[PDB]
Structure 1
Amino acid sequence: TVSSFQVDCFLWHVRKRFADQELGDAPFLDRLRADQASLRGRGSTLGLDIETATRAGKQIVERILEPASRYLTDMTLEEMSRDWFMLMPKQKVAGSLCIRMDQAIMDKNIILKANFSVIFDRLETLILLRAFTEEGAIVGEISPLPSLPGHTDEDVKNAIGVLIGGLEWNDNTVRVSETLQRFA
C-alpha cells in the first residue's frame, strides 16, 4: 500500500503544475488542498517523507507509458438509448453479437441505421445497429456483447445478412443506410 502512497504524492506534484499555469478550476484547487492535507496525514502514519516518496513514484509510474481510425454515426445517442419491445421476439447470438428482431412485422419498408468505427476502407467495431420502419418503429437490433474476443467485418456482414433475411421473409422490403451500403 506504500506504492499507492508514492503514486499519490507523485500525481499530486504533477497536478500542481496544471493549476500553476492553465485556466485552472476552484474545485481542482480545493481538491489539491484536501489532497495534500490527507497526504500529510498519510506521511504521518507511514513515517516516510514525501521527498523520499515522489522519487519512488517517478520510477514506479514512468514504466507505464505506451491504426488511424475515425467514427461514423447514422444514429444519435437518443436513437440508441430509445426503449422498445418485440411483440413476438426472435433473437439469437452469433459469434459475439446479439441479434434480435420482431417476427410480427410484415409488408413494412425497413431502414437499417448503425453507429460504428472505421479503419482504412472497412469497419472495425459496431457500437449499435437498429432497424426502423418508414413509420418510425424499431423492429430489430444488432447489439455488441461484453466479450474479450470481439468481432471484425466478416461476421458483422453475416449478422446484417441474417437480419435482412429474417425481415425479408415476411414480405418486408429492407434497405440499409448509405453508410452500410458503402461499407457492407
Structure 2
Amino acid sequence: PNTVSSFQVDCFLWHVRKRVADQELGDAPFLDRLRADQASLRGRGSTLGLDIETATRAGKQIVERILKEESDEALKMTMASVPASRYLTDMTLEEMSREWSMLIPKQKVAGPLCIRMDQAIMDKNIILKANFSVIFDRLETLILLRAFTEEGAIVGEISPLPSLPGHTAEDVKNAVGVLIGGLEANDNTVRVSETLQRFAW
C-alpha cells in the first residue's frame, strides 16, 4: 500500500485548480468538483497519515520535473526562472587576493579539497565567508572559502586542489565540518554566512 504518488499529484493539481475558480469565474460544475475533490483529498490525507501541505510540496518536484514536450511547454518564464545559475561572493576581491600566515599550520586533504588552518587561534568568534558557483538550489563548484575573525583576520582556508578540480557539494560540506571541528576544538565560536548555511547544511 505504498504507490501514493497519485495523492501528491492530486494535492498539487487541486491547489492550482483552486486558483482558477478562486480568482476568475471558472465554472459551477468546476467549483463543485473543486469542493468535492477537496473533501476527498482531506479524507485520503486522514486515512494516509500524510499532510496536505507536504504532499503538495512533493507534488511540485514530482510534476514540474517530468514535463517534457509532446508539444511546446509552459515557456517556463524567465522572469520566474532565469534559471538560477549564479555565482555568490561573500568575500571582497581584497579579501580574496590577501595573503596570510599560520603560526601553527594544519593541512588536511578532504577529498578534492585542501583544508588549512592556524591552530594558534583560540577563544574567538569566527565567521566563514566563501565565493562559489551555484546551480539551481545546490552548490556546484567552490572557488574559495576562508575564515575571518571578529576583526577580519584570516585563520582558515578551504581551497580546491590546483591539479584536481573540481568537486561536489557534499565534499564541501565534509570539509566545512572538518574545519569547524578543528577550529572549535580550540574553544572557538564558529558562525557561517547565510549563503554558506543555505548551500552547506
Same fold (TM over 0.5): yes
Q: CA deviation at 1:21?
A: 52
After TM superposition, where is structure 1 displaced by more than 3 Å over at least 4 residues in a row? Answer: 1-64
Q: CA deviation at 1:147?
A: 3.4
Q: Residues 49 and 128 of structure 1: is their aligned pair in 2 closer, same or farther, counting only changes over 3 Å?
A: closer
Q: Residues 67 and 150 of structure 1: is their aligned pair in 2 closer, same or farther, counting only changes over 3 Å?
A: farther
> Computing the radius of gyration over CA atoms, which structure comes out larger, 1 or 2?
1
Name structure 1 gaps, 5 residues minimum: none
User: What's the RMSD between the two structures over aligned residues?
Assistant: 16.0
Q: Distance in 2 between matches of 1:43 and 1:169?
A: 47
Choose 148-157 or 126-135, whichever is displaced more: 148-157
Q: CA deviation at 1:56?
A: 55
Q: CA deviation at 1:53?
A: 64
Q: Distance in 2 between matches of 1:174 and 1:91?
A: 19
Q: CA deviation at 1:109?
A: 0.3
**Matched residue count:** 183
Q: Distance in 2 between matches of 1:163 and 1:16?
A: 49
Cα contact 1:96–1:147 (8 A) shared by 2:
no
Paired residue secondary structure (2:162)? coil
Q: Distance in 1 between matches of 2:45 and 2:184?
A: 69
Name structure 2 gaps, 5 residues minimum: 67-81
Q: Residues 167 and 20 of structure 1: is their aligned pair in 2 closer, same or farther, counting only changes over 3 Å?
A: closer
Deviations 1:27-64 (A, max 9, x none): 99999999999999999999999999999999999999
Q: Residues 17 and 68 of structure 1: is their aligned pair in 2 closer, same or farther, counting only changes over 3 Å?
A: closer
Q: Distance in 1 between matches of 2:149 and 2:53?
A: 65
Q: Distance in 2 between matches of 1:158 and 1:76?
A: 25
Deviations 1:101-147 (A, max 9, x none): 00001100000000000011110011010000002111000011123
Q: Distance in 1 between matches of 2:99 and 2:40?
A: 45
Percent of paired sites with the same residue: 95
